[PDB]
Each structure stands twice: as C-alpha cells, then as structure tokens.
Amino acid sequence: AKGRTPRSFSQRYGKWNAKFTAFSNPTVASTILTNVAPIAQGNFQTNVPKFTSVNEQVSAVLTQYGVTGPSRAIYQGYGLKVARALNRIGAGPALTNMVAGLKAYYVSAYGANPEILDAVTNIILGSPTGY
DNA sequence: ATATATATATATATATATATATATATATATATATATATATATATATATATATATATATATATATATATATATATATATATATATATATATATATATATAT
Secondary structure, eight states, X not given: OOSSSOOOHHHHHHHHHHHHHHHTSHHHHHHHHHHHHHHHHHXXXXXXXXXXXXXXXXXXXXXXXXXXXXXXXXXXXXXXXXXXXXXXXXXXXXXXXXXXXXXXXXXXXXXXXXXXXXXXXXXXXXXXXXX
C-alpha cells in the first residue's frame, strides 16, 4: 500500500520535504541512527568484503593488460556490477543472461574492450561466459 | 604615719628600650645619581648567517584529514517514486457475525 496511487511533482516534493525537515531534528536523527547503527555495521561487515576482493583481483588483472588512469574505472565498474549480480540472484542461467547483458551494455555505451571484459569476468566468475 | 603595687608631677643625675635632631666619620640593608668598564636576567635595533616553534607566499610533486565537482560502477544509512506481492503497526470503509 505504498505505490498504489500516482504521485505528481508537488506531492513527491511535499512528502520529501516534510520527511527531510523531520529528520533534521536533533532527537529524530540521533534516535534513528543510534538505533540502526548495529544493524548497519552488521550489513557492512556481511557485504563489503566480497567487493573489496573483487576490487583487488580486477586491479591485478588490469595491470597485466596495461590499463591506466580513469579507463581503469570502466573495468572496475563492470567488475563490481557483475559481482552485484552474483550476490543478488546467484549462479545459474539467470547470471549468464545478466553477464551477457552487462557486456553488451558496456561494449556499446562505454567503449569497453571485449578481451579485457572477458579477463575481468574470468577472474570474477571463473570463465569468460560464466557458465 | 608606715610597707606593696598602677600612674601624674618639682629638681639634678644614672642604666634599659622606641623615635626626632646638631656635626664628622664607620658598617649592614632598600633605592636615585656623576663617569668608564664587567657579569646575570627581560626587551627594542644595525648587518650577515645558523637552529627551534606559529603562520603568509613563488613553482612542481607526495602522504593524512574536512568538504565541493567531471564520468561509470559498488557497499552502509535517511527519505521521495514506477508496478505487482508479502509481513508488523496507526486509522477510514463494504457486509455479516462474536468478545471487552
């Protein structure tokens, strides 16, 4: 019962402004944040190691291919994207479809190299295709 | 009229202590000066240079921290949405029925 009626710009802005003004109160923000701190710490601890590892391994792969500068970000981004899928839905045919779609995305929009994309997905999932 | 004690006086003189003076000199201490020089400490300057610390700059580069951005992607948290569905809670209804 949250996304049932359409909301226009004035409605979205009114509700967002009300909630943002409310959160700016010292007591409201302090209470909410000190209550959710342990759960936030637990979620960070459960999730971020899987992505720092991907960062390090894709860095190692990128240095062997000579990628320097902001062009590394491209492949780093792709790596992280793939990892997200592996964390979200798991391994299987759905992950194959999403890997193919992400490669098409990056090759067509961002001018990525197919060979380096294969190398990144190989260091992450085990094979270029991801089967 | 006598003896002991607390004081005031008339007259000269003596010893103890607190001070003020007339005349010169000596020693100790607190300071002010005339004349040169030295040593210790607090500071201001003339001329160059060095070391320590607080900052401002000329020119490039590096590391740590607080933020703002150019471009895509990831994770944690506060919220606003597009579209179905589920769970907890605060209420309004359509229809019958039960309990406080």
